[PDB]
Amino acid sequence: XXXXXXXXXXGXXGXXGXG
């Protein structure tokens, strides 16, 4: 938070898949 910015709410990661 509240005084700058950022958005989203966390950080990230990417993802992946599986098989």
PDB file of C-alpha atoms in Angstrom, residues 13-19:
ATOM      1  CA  UNK A  13       6.477 -19.697 -10.563  1.00  0.00           C
ATOM      2  CA  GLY A  14       5.549 -20.637 -14.110  1.00  0.00           C
ATOM      3  CA  UNK A  15       3.832 -24.011 -14.077  1.00  0.00           C
ATOM      4  CA  UNK A  16       4.749 -27.188 -15.918  1.00  0.00           C
ATOM      5  CA  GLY A  17       2.561 -30.090 -16.977  1.00  0.00           C
ATOM      6  CA  UNK A  18       2.764 -33.689 -15.823  1.00  0.00           C
ATOM      7  CA  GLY A  19       2.775 -36.643 -18.189  1.00  0.00           C
TER       8      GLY A  19
END
